[PDB]
Amino acid sequence: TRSAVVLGGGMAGMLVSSMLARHVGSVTVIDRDAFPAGPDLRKGVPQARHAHILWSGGARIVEELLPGTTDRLLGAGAHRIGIPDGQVSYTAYGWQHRFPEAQFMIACSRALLDWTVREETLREERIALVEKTEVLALLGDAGRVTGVRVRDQESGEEREVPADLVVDTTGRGSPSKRLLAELGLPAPEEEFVDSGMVYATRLFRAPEAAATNFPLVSVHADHRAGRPGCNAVLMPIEDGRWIVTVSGTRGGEPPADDEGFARFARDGVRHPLVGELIAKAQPLTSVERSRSTVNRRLHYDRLATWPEGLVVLGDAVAAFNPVYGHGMSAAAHSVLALRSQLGQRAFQPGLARAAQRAIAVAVDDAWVLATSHDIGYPGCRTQTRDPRLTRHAGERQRVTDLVGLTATRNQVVNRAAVALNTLSAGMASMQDPAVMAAVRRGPEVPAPTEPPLRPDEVARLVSGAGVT
Numbered sequence: 476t477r478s479a480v481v482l483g484g485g486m487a488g489m490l491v492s493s494m495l496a497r498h499v500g501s502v503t504v505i506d507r508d509a510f511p512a513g514p515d516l517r518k519g520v521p522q523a524r525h526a527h528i529l530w531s532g533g534a535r536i537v538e539e540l541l542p543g544t545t546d547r548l549l550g551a552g553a554h555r556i557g558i559p560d561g562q563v564s565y566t567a568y569g570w571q572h573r574f575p576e577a578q579f580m581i582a583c584s585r586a587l588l589d590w591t592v593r594e595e596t597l598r599e600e601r602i603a604l605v606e607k608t609e610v611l612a613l614l615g616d617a618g619r620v621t622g623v624r625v626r627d628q629e630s631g632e633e634r635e636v637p638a639d640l641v642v643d644t645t646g647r648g649s650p651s652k653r654l655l656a657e658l659g660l661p662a663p664e665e666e667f668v669d670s671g672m673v674y675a676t677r678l679f680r681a682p683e684a685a686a687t688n689f690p691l692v693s694v695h696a697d698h699r700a701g702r703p704g705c706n707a708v709l710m711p712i713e714d715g716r717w718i719v720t721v722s723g724t725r726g727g728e729p730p731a732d733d734e735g736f737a738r739f740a741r742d743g744v745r746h747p748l749v750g751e752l753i754a755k756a757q758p759l760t761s762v763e764r765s766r767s768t769v770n771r772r773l774h775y776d777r778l779a780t781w782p783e784g785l786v787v788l789g790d791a792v793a794a795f796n797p798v799y800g801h802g803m804s805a806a807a808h809s810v811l812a813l814r815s816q817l818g819q820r821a822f823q824p825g826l827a828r829a830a831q832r833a834i835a836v837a838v839d840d841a842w843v844l845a846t847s848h849d850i851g852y853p854g855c856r857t858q859t860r861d862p863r864l865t866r867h868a869g870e871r872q873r874v875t876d877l878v879g880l881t882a883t884r885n886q887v888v889n890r891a892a893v894a895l896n897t898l899s900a901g902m903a904s905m906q907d908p909a910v911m912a913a914v915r916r917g918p919e920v921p922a923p924t925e926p927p928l929r930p931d932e933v934a935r936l937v938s939g940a941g942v943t
């Protein structure tokens with residue numbers, strides 16, 4: 476009984492459809508893109524060409540919604556990299572000491588990830604993906620949404636698709652503002668923080684012995700220094716490749732040519748490690764850039780009136796600067812928020828509004844971590860009324876620089892710090908007296924003077940071929 480319509484067949488649409496199918500009779504997923512039968516790139520998800528990190532916090536939610544997905548990923552070549560034992564990271568406060576594992580992440584191409592999530596989701600015969608279909612309008616009115624009017628791209632025919640619950644997961648380019656304007660709802664408050672960052676990514680084939688068990692490598696900007704923020708990240712993926720992404724805020728954007736890529740990875744960042752590693756490797760693709768960098772949030776939950784049977788989640792409600800890598804886990808967290816409201820209120824009046832409010836709390840931590848670090852860079856453009864970004868930005872940056880400094884050299888602080896950064900624990904968890912005590916205890920190890928690479932990792936950057 477009861478039917479749901481999901482707008483957009485990306486990561487959020489699939490996760491929300493897996494969940495919704497356990498509460499409703501039928502799920503229909505509408506997407507305007509065409510979907511490949513294998514793990515390939517598609518135009519509906521252009522971000523798939525850049526490095527994608529799946530933090531533990533989101534990974535554990537994906538596992539719960541789609542049991543077995545983690546292993547199908549690992550079974551297909553994805554790497555499980557422990558944090559911080561498997562990262563070589565030059566943070567704004569110096570090198571992170573590689574303490575034993577506290578959290579983890581899954582390292583794979585986004586194309587493989589999306590395909591593995593879709594395939595596992597669509598095993599449920601009651602979910603149906605409707606490809607190459609444009610979303611024209613929401614059916615019903617400002618009081619209650621009753622489905623969506625769509626158009627088939629091939630035939631051009633328009634038809635209405637009924638629904639007791641419509642979920643918009645059309646991503647960052649969501650037409651939800653248009654859709655609800657045609658419904659007759661007021662425009663929602665839009666908050667954004669635009670550092671003006673730009674991405675540049677190339678694929679590489681790793682040295683043969685380094686195809687497995689290689690660490691995640693990152694060089695971070697110093698947000699405290701009044702200079703454009705430049706970063707560089709090297710991540711293993713399936714089939715013995717490395718995806719390498721370099722980024723830079725307004726005034727420090729990486730170039731588009733292959734030659735300038737290696738120099739930026741060498742000279743454009745605060746340490747040339749990533750530039751040194753990619754020179755052990757062979758390029759496979761040319762430079763791909765992207766400007767989809769703005770942290771933008773739509774406060775749908777604060778509207779004066781909200782229709783029953785309508786929910787917005789994923790990038791359509793809150794998108795982030797990708798250098799922190801929270802987007803997918805934020806979408807996962809908001810699917811569990813919808814699920815929790817479904818079990819509490821079923822489909823009674825108030826479900827859509829209660830879900831929209833709960834989704835706003837679900838994404839808040841990822842929204843704060845990104846905006847409070849982007850707001851400092853020179854030339855940053857902002858539109859916000861949030862006091863945490865306007866009034867208490869200086870004091871919140873003072874506590875955060877001391878947790879970050881100590882976490883590089885204190886095991887307890889790091890543990891609690893990476894639990895928050897991977898969205899495996901809430902913001903309040905940093906207020907545990909046991910955490911602030913360790914912060915006051917100070918460093919237990921010296922600050923590393925060189926990149927903390929293992930000899931056996933560096934050893935596998937060469938083959939030894941020309942040696943009798």
Ligand SMILES: Cc1cc2nc3c(=O)[nH]c(=O)nc-3n(C[C@H](O)[C@H](O)[C@H](O)COP(=O)(O)OP(=O)(O)OC[C@H]3O[C@@H](n4cnc5c(N)ncnc54)[C@H](O)[C@@H]3O)c2cc1C
Nearest residue numbers: 483485486487507519522527528646789790797800802803
């Ligand atoms: C460069 C970059 C790097 C990133 N790195 C990370 C990372 O390391 N870790 C992480 O967790 N997140 C990362 N993200 C964020 C991540 O890509 C998104 O958070 C995630 O894709 C959210 O999924 P979604 O379903 O909301 O949107 P999408 O994944 O984009 O899915 C949207 C879907 O809706 C469809 N659609 C769009 N518009 C319409 C329309 N008008 N009508 C019908 N269908 C439509 C699209 O075809 C697509 O199928 C990164 C993003 C970028 C841009």
Ligand SMILES: [Cl-]
Nearest residue numbers: 521522765767
């Ligand atoms: Cl992109």
